């Protein structure tokens, strides 16, 4: 109920971890950003924190889209 938070938060996280695991990950793609906004996030902020540490590690290029995310969300 704060879809206006998912994309900013997520982006926070993607930054934390991208720096924590030294990964050249800059950010999410549109396709991905959508998904993140549609997911119900039962865990809420917590679950997104995990979903993205996980997506940062699984990340291969500079961005994240339906690819790594769908694996979870």
């Amino acid at each position: 109920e704060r879809k206006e938070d998912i994309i900013p938060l997520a982006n926070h996280f993607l930054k934390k971890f991208s720096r924590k695991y030294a990964k050249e990950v800059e950010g999410f793609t549109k396709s991905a950003q959508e998904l993140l906004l549609s997911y119900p996030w039962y865990g809420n902020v917590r679950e997104l924190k995990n979903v993205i540490e996980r997506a940062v590690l699984f990340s291969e290029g500079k961005f994240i889209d339906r690819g790594e995310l769908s694996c979870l969300v």
Binding site: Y21, G43, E47, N50, E53, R54, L57, F58
Partner: protein, 173 residues
């Protein structure tokens, strides 16, 4: 020679393991009996940064529910009739290395909690009193039951789920 991974979904799961390499967040492995869970933990750890470090695997079913909260962590002297020394811990033995808790669902609510506290704080105390030990152990839970379900049954702490649910691998039969 080598080990065995060749099916797509596993051709995959191996990599997921490889990527997770440089990490330490707990990992939750789930698949039917025999699918290779405990084989993945072992591989995750062979691949983590702490491969050379110990691997403390302990079946949570291989110990009466009333003595798990006495052997996982440790024990502060004279709190239970007969104590030769405050009891060390698999957590302490696994300090610096991996702690593969097999069959998680079989954790008492009391320890499910007590683990959570150590997954976040990393500090623990043997029985009543306070923490006086420093343990750096990467949690690796594997269970063959469906965690989520157990959460609606109240047999499994949810917050402990998401905590171990950082990285989640599911081995298909």
């Amino acid at each position: 020679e080598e080990y065995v991974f060749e099916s797509p979904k596993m051709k995959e799961i191996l990599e997921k393991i490889k990527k997770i390499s440089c990490a330490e967040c707990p990992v939750l492995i789930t698949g039917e009996s025999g699918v290779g869970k405990e084989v993945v933990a072992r591989l995750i750890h062979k691949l983590s940064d702490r491969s050379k470090e110990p691997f403390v695997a302990l079946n949570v079913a291989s110990i009466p529910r009333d003595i798990f909260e006495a052997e996982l962590f440790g024990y502060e002297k004279g709190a239970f009739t007969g104590a030769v020394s405050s009891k060390e811990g698999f957590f302490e033995l696994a300090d610096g290395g991996t702690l593969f808790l097999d069959e998680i669902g079989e954790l008492s609510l009391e320890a499910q909690a007590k683990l959570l506290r150590v997954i976040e704080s990393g500090k623990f105390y043997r029985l009543g009193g306070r923490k006086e030990i420093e343990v750096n152990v990467r949690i690796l839970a594997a269970t063959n039951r469906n965690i989520k379900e157990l959460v609606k049954e109240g047999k499994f702490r949810e917050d402990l789920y998401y905590r171990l649910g950082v990285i989640e691998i599911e081995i298909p039969p």
